[PDB]
């Protein structure tokens, strides 16, 4: 069963931080124009942080000081390299940065 990635719509005023919770290497992805994958961070650009909670299975994926260009689509995925190449991806969530 894949990880969850919530909230599905994250409404944040620009300048505030935004944190998704990924509950499941663990990658945080942003879907670009041309709908291709960009890796923002991994567990284990300074504005995209991943914090493993004491829970161990939950992770906070945070945008520090969200800008309007940060608006887009995001997800998390867990990769197992072997035996058998496997990825379990979350459903896609949207970051909606609004004007202050």
């Amino acid at each position, epitope marked *: 069963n894949p990880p969850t990635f919530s909230p599905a719509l994250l409404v944040v005023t620009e300048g505030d931080n935004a944190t998704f919770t990924c509950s499941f*290497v663990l*990658n945080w992805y942003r879907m670009s124009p041309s709908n291709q*994958t960009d*890796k923002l961070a*991994a567990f284990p650009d300074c504005r995209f942080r991943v914090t493993q909670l004491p829970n161990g299975r939950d992770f906070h994926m945070s945008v520090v000081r969200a800008r309007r260009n940060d608006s887009g689509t995001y997800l998390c995925g867990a*990769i197992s*390299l*072997a*035996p*058998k*190449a*496997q*990825i379990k991806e979350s459903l896609r969530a949207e970051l909606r940065v609004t004007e202050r």
Partner: antibody, heavy 113, light 112 residues
Framework: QLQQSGAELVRPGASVKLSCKALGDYEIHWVKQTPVHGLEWIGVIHPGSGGTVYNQKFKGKATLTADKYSSTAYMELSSLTSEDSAVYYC?????????????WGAGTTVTVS | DILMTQDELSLPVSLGDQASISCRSSQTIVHTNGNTYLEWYLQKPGQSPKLLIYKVSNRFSGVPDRFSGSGSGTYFTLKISRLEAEDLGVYYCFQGSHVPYTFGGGTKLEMK
């Protein structure tokens, strides 16, 4: 397709780096072939994360890397001996597929003098 | 490590004959997810290996149905009914259920 680099002619004790360009999510595997030892799985890299898993028999002998801004994977062979003279294939495994190696490179031959 | 042992090194045939290639694994090869990643590859002379059968018995896309795979536990078999010239080469079994992945030593199907 997987396009492999040209034949290598190298001396004992040296190192050589082979490349594999993916044309046209996956993991990239390397396989050695010799008449006496057959086909041997060397290891795998996931280019997106850089993660690797090695066959312990090839730890130290082979180092797998992959570029981030080109679809190229590499295998560096070190401490070369006549036992390393062989054909080396790169092959691909799709994420979340039911099978392994449906696409293979043509192989790169290494000859240790 | 799992050792994959093929029963015969060579099989001399005539075109149109039946061929059977068997492979014994030293341990069972069921992945933790329940699938058995037992595969058969054909390496035609001077070519790279090509995937014929995956998950024991499934033909890869485009592989003709004269090829069939069966087996379970530690014994797996590829059968070629009425073999054609394009079938000549070396057949290798392969397990990808447990790291490190391992291949059989090959069985060469050649003209008798």
């Amino acid at each position: 397709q997987l396009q492999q680099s040209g034949a290598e002619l190298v001396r004992p004790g040296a190192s050589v780096k082979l490349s594999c360009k993916a044309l046209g999510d996956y993991e990239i595997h390397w396989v050695k072939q010799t008449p006496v030892h057959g086909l041997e799985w060397i290891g795998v890299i996931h280019p997106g994360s850089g993660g690797t898993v090695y066959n312990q028999k090839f730890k130290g002998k082979a180092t797998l890397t992959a570029d981030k801004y080109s679809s190229t994977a590499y295998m560096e062979l070190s401490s070369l001996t006549s036992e390393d003279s062989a054909v080396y294939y790169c092959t691909r495994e799709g994420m979340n597929t039911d099978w392994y190696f449906d696409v293979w490179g043509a192989g790169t031959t290494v000859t240790v003098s | 490590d799992i050792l994959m042992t093929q029963d015969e090194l060579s099989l001399p045939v005539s075109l149109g004959d039946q061929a059977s290639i068997s492979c014994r694994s030293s341990q069972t090869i069921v992945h933790t997810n329940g699938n058995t990643y037992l595969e058969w590859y054909l390496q035609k002379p001077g070519q790279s290996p090509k995937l014929l059968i995956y998950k024991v018995s499934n033909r890869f896309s485009g592989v003709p149905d004269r090829f069939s795979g069966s087996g379970s536990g530690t014994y797996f078999t590829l059968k070629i009914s009425r073999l054609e010239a394009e079938d000549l080469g070396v057949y290798y079994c392969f397990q990808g259920s447990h790291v490190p992945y391992t291949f059989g030593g090959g069985t060469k199907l050649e003209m008798k």
